[PDB]
Amino acid sequence: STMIGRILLTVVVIFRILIVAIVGETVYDDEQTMFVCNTLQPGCNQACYDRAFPISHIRYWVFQIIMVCTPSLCFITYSVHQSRFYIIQVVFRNALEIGFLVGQYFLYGFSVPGLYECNRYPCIKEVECYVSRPTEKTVFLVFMFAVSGICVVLNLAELNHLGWR
Amino acid sequence: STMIGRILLTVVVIFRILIVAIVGETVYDDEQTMFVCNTLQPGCNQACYDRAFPISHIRYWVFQIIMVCTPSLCFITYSVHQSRFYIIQVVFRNALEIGFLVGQYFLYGFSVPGLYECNRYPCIKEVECYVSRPTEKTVFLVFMFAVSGICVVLNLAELNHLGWR
Amino acid sequence: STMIGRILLTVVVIFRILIVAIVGETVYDDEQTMFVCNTLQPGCNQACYDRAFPISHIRYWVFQIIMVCTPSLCFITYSVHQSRFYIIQVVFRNALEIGFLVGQYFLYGFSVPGLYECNRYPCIKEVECYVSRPTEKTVFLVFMFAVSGICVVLNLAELNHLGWR
Amino acid sequence: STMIGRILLTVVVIFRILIVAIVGETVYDDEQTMFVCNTLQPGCNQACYDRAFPISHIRYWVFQIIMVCTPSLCFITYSVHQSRFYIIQVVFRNALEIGFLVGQYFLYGFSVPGLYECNRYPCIKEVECYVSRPTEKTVFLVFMFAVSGICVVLNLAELNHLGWR
Amino acid sequence: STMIGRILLTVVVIFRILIVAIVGETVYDDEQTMFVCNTLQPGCNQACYDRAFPISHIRYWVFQIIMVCTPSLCFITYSVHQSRFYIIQVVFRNALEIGFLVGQYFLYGFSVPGLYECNRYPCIKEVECYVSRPTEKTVFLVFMFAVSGICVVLNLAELNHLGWR
Amino acid sequence: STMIGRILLTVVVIFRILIVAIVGETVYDDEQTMFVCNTLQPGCNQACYDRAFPISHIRYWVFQIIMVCTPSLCFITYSVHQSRFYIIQVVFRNALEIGFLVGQYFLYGFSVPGLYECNRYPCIKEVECYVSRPTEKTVFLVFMFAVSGICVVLNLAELNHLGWR
Amino acid sequence: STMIGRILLTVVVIFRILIVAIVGETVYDDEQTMFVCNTLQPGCNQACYDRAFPISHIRYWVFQIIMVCTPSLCFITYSVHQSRFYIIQVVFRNALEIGFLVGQYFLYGFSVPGLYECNRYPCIKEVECYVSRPTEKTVFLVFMFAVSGICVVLNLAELNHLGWR
Amino acid sequence: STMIGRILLTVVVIFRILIVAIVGETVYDDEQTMFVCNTLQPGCNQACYDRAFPISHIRYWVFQIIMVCTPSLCFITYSVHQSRFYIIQVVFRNALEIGFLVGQYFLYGFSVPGLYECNRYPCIKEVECYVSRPTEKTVFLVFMFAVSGICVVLNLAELNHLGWR
Amino acid sequence: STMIGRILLTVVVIFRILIVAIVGETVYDDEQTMFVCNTLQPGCNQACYDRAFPISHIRYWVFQIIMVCTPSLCFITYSVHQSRFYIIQVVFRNALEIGFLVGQYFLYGFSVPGLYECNRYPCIKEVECYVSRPTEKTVFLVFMFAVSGICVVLNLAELNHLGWR
Amino acid sequence: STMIGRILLTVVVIFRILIVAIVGETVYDDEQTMFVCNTLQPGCNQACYDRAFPISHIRYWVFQIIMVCTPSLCFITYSVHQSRFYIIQVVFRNALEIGFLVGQYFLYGFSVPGLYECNRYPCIKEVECYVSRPTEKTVFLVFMFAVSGICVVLNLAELNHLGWR
Amino acid sequence: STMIGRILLTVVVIFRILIVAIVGETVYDDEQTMFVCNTLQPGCNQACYDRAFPISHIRYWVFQIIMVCTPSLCFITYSVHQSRFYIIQVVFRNALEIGFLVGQYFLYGFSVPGLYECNRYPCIKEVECYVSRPTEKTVFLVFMFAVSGICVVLNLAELNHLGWR
Amino acid sequence: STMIGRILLTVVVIFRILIVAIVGETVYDDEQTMFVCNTLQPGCNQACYDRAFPISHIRYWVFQIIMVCTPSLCFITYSVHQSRFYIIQVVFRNALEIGFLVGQYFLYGFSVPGLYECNRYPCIKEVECYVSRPTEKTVFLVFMFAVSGICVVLNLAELNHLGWR
């Protein structure tokens, strides 16, 4: 039962990479061009879009995917150049995945609303703005959260079998 | 007769992958840019498009194609690492393909109409909107439904020869 | 004389694949963006374009190219897994190529006109619309018809040498 | 002296392929979007552009490049499957290259002018239209004519050494 | 401890290359199209954008990435063709990386502001302009500065072990 | 000292190829779309852009890069088919590189100005036009001139060691 | 007390004439030009304005003012040409003034609302339209109703003193 | 009874003059500016308006009012300069008023419709146009017809008392 | 001293009439056409203008001028038809002028501001609007208040000489 | 019979004055604002309108009306200041009226066409322009020609009775 | 010599009245509609026009013309109702004319410039605005100043003949 | 012969007054609104119109008409209040009419051209502008010059009969 778990970790990792690389590049393609606010002021659109979406979802996910694969590359390069490395890389992977999951929760939450109200200069008082494609982005958010949670659960499993404290 | 059936399963799977990857990427390319509603309200176009098409067809199909190939990858990785796996992966493939076919039917139906009437905020009362390229999308829908049905029929065939109950 | 015919079948097939893949992707690129009608009604452009061009030429040709190569793939996979197959695949290829040629003739004809008059809702009475790049598309149509005819002639040749009735 | 000539034929062929594939795809990219006529009539722009440029230069050149390489592929496939073929393929190459050069001269001439005057329906009387990037296209025309002429000269050389009449 | 340092240099170099190649190409894509100034003068937008951003960040980083890999290529080619080379290439790498880091600091600083005021001809007096996506670009700046600093620290480490003065 | 010079020639050639292929394709992307003149005449923009930039910089550089590599390909093909060739190809490389450098100097100079005044038909008298991104293009010009000069210097070095007169 | 009543009738009549002639001509001046509906359909504005305001207030009032002065002119012309006439003209004046007051009440009511919703062809479903200057027009309505009521009361007074039944 | 009839003729004539001069000048003021057709063709609006309304109602009525007062002016001037004149001027007035009433009926009818469909050059096929203020104009038409009929009836009365045949 | 006061009353009355009739008709001419709000909503301009200026200044002043002259007309008509009337008309004039002055103060105040913020449907939240010609209108307000005050003072003077209580 | 002719001259003169003064001022009001040509050139509209209508009809008619009344004013002033004058003024009136009628015929003809084609600088080649209200203007032309002809006939009558040669 | 001076005062007064009433009403007609500023901000045009021209020239002149005629009206009314009045009215006329001339000089100066630079909210920093018809307005200013000066000189003349101190 | 000359002076004066007052007010009505220049600069239109037409023709003519009637008014007022005056007023009239005629010639010339080229700030270099209605204005110029010349000739006639030197 604990033997097959490794296979599921490898399969989930590859599945996540494929989903992000093949489909995610094109939901966000028109994110700023189809964002519109009810106003006549030059420059209000730029400021309000920047305030609503500081970092796009797909950039965060690509960065996370690349960064969680670094301990494996280090371990592989070590063996090519030539037990402690295994434990250390497991600890580092655990830390990286919990940090990234909590950061995801704190940055974005669990939904993308359809309306946004912004009151940043050069806008006059508060104005109302409207988002493009909220439902698809919410579904993507929830799916990615679930898959990353599965991965977090899986990595903790192996730690306790080898680890003691 | 039951021997050749496996060859037809492999050929249909590859055919589906090729059709989705080569042609589908470009029928949907202008889906939102050429969607137009009869109105003068900012933000009505975004809301009504989001209500008419929550998830685009091609995203659902790519996800389905990737997800129905996971039991094979798991079985292959197992053998590389090193009879029960065959039966279990057959059961899982059957379940995944029936679930995806029923979900397709419940989400989209069998046609894409040319007109859509929307009454979502910020629109005033009900408004009329107009869709781009309905006939091509309807043809694609019907073809994909037929091919997936063929695959469903084929997978059930092998289950009953080996299975008992 | 009948020996070299096979070489010409292989060369024509590859030539057709290359022409469709390399050049055809870009004549049709702006098909809908540069289609214009003389009217002030929202939504008339979409309906009239959909009525004039239900399925784009290049989509039909890509589908045909992929579908006429399936019996060969089936025969090849059979030998990898391990005389009747040869005859059957020849019959199937013949049927597929005659069906596709007749369907091409019935769907599109032999020319693309420069003007089109449309009377579909929401348009008021009949309106006049104007097509982009008719001459290039007509030339492409005629060339593809000629090449497919050559292939049809070639496939019938081998059938009668081996076949009897 | 006649020995090295073959090397120059191979080098010129590869040079032509590289120049057409790498640079030509992007001079013509905006050919129709930046073509403009002095008029207020819908549909006059489409008709006048179609009359000025029936077939784009780059499509003709790609077709020519692919078609002049067919006798070599036939000869190569023959040897793989298994003196007369050499002579026949030389004759065919000669014919194809003279035909394509004369056709180029008759279709396009030696320059692309900056102004064009068109009197096709739906335009009222004659109107004046203006072309984008004439100088670059003229230079490309002249260079391609020179290279193709060199190739024509080279192919005739070998014919007379082996040929008699 | 000094042994593993080389592995971290190789991993950081590859990580930097991947981050620049995969994600950076698309934050800057719309840099000039969504830059807008409050004015009615033709040509003021071009001049003010040119004054605000003389060289785009991504061009500088790509150039730096390519240029810091030249001593390694020279050393590798030398061995293929066939101790002093090692020391010299280390000195050159050190010099190149300190020069590039200082140049980065002097050209761009540590942030990208949201507003810019420009007074260049043909603009009348001073005008106000507005930048697109400042926060994402600031984050990218800071991350790249940190990674390059790590690399600078690492390269100095090996110099002092072998070097004396 | 003269031995290592060959390595530097190979490294500079590869460096130039990489810089042109990876970065240059995108500075010039919007060259004509963001070129604007102060006028109300149709067709003045096209004529004045054509007069200011007859051949784009990147097309000239790609052509030069491809053309300066032909003697090497000829020499390589000769050896594959099977001392005088070495001397002749050196002479030809020298001639090609001096000709291309002088042509660069005579066509473009050393800078790209921000303003251009044009008086070509259909423009009325003289008009003023405005260029996009002058500083980046000037920097690229200067860098390419320097690298090509280095290559010219290097090729002359080897000529005089083997050559006499 | 009944003697002075005649003076008040003459003063009220002149007051009404002055108010209508001097001020009313300019509140209604922009009635249709500043009427706007939320729609993109040609011709919807005309139909909805016609349905909201069939006869403008000021035209009705001018007609009424002119028509209620006809019995006096007839009586005056009779005397110029040369007791029964007095009674008859009093009866006719009474009838005309009650008819006009009731018609005013039935046509317009007591207020002008700021919003109007119209569903007349060529409009799609129901649309919302917006009125200009509602408060001033409501005040004018109420004032005119009050003055006309005073006149009605005054004319009945004299009838009963001379009349019996 | 026949004595008072003359007074009613004078009163009706003055009433008609006042109504036409005071109110009619401003219903028709915006007749052409607010006439709109669904089309993109220059010059279609002018032609279709000219075809729908060849002579405006108010011009016809002013001309009629002036022309029916000429016999009186002639008779008056005759007496100033100094029984047969009375009879002749009565005959002429009768003829003029019947001719003008019949001409009114034949030119305009009894209503002004809200829609008009026009198929005059330069319009393409038939187009639909929309009229401004139809109800007010219909009411004016009917009122003027009634008043002119009353006048016709009155003039015939006096003719038969003096006339015999 | 009290004798000349009557002359000053007559002169001030005529002066006020002249100023209102000759100059006031044209300061307010463009009141609504040059009123503008920062918004993209149809119908917000109408509602906010109606809320800012319910009754225009010039309409109120014309009404006041006409209404304060009615007791004089009544007294004059009485004498034409044929001491108590003098006292009563003085009381009525006093009452009318105090009522109109207080009403002016309560409706408009003492200034017209340049900015106005409105939050009436269909506007979204609060919006900012901008007034035309505030200074001229403020000056007119103050001048009219001063003149009317002078008239009020003058009318009270005569009341106390004849009146007792 | 010749006695009454003078009365008809006076009546026709007054009738003409009234028709020109009351109705003609408003058919021509929008003559240039609703004149439109199919072109994109600034300044073509002005030149083509000036070429089509050098002097407006109504200006010519007003000038004629004023100028044909000068001999009467001279004769009247002479008598006020204090047989030959009568004859001379008759001769002058005859001459003025024949000259003005012939000039009318030579300047304008008998109709106003709906289309006009103009080829004046700055227009490119020939362009097509469209006239407003042709039918009403044609009717006015014909009526004025008829009335002026009647006047010409009448003035000749009196000349021959008094004149001899 | 002092006798004729009165005639010149009466003639100058009437001349001034005629010039102001007949010509001045139409130079200023388009004062605000053709005033334009180089900016994209709503509401900047209104504020800057209000700051440049607080009170229009023609309003000031009409007010002055009416106000300088009040002592004459008072004196005339006095005589109608029925030596000290003559002296007092002369003193008052003198005072009014010097005050109005000095006020004119302090408000407007001696010229109207063609450019104006404004820095009032809501404008961003300083902006440049452009005036319509400066030369005609400057000429009018100078002429009115000269005529008013002549009148001032004339009124002082009579004061010193009758006055002592 | 010299007796009748006075009558012709009175008739010409009245004729000129009538022509200027009745027709001239409406040729110049749209002088600035239909003036257009080929440019994109704000404020160039105002400056170039001001430079082309400093004082409009009709303003100069009205001023001249009023000013040449002042000596008559002075002489008339003198006689009302109560030989030298006659001579002096004749001298003054002569001087005024020669001065005004020469000033007309020096200001305007004899024609109004259709094109005007202007190079005033804020325009860039020289630009081309286009005038409205040149032919009608030229005809008016010539007619007014002729009439004023006739008047000049007439006034000199009487001077020499009474005058000596």
Numbering used by the authors:
A (entry chain E), B (entry chain F), C (entry chain A), D (entry chain B), E (entry chain D), F (entry chain C), ...: 19 to 100, 196 to 278
Manuscript text:
Connexin 36 (Cx36) is responsible for signal transmission in electrical synapses by forming interneuronal gap junctions. The direct connection between adjacent cells is made by end-to-end docking of two hemichannels (termed connexons) from each cell, each consisting of six protomers, thereby forming a dodecameric gap junction channel (GJC). Cx36 is mainly expressed in neurons and forms the major component of GJCs in electrical synapses, playing important roles in cognitive functions, including memory consolidation and epileptogenesis. Here, we determine cryo-electron microscopy structures of Cx36 GJC at 2.2–3.6 Å resolutions, revealing a dynamic equilibrium between its closed and open states.
Wild-type Cx36 (Cx36-WT) proteins were solubilized in lauryl maltose neopentyl glycol (LMNG) and cholesterol hemisuccinate (CHS) and purified as dodecameric GJCs. Thus, we performed cryo-EM experiments of Cx36-WT in LMNG/CHS (Cx36LMNG-WT) and Cx36-BRIL in soybean lipid nanodiscs (Cx36Nano-BRIL) and obtained 3.2 Å and 3.4 Å consensus maps, respectively. Next, we conducted protomer-focused 3D classification to understand the structural equilibrium in each GJC sample and found that Cx36LMNG-WT and Cx36Nano-BRIL GJCs showed the FN/PLN ratios of 71:29 and 12:88, respectively. While Cx36-WT and Cx36-BRIL in soybean lipids were mainly in the PLN conformation, those in detergents were mainly or completely in the FN conformation, suggesting that detergents contributed to the PLN-to-FN transition more than lipids. Since the GJC pore in the full FN conformation is funnel-shaped, detergents with large head groups may be more tightly packed at the intracellular layer in the pore, resulting in increased FN protomer populations.
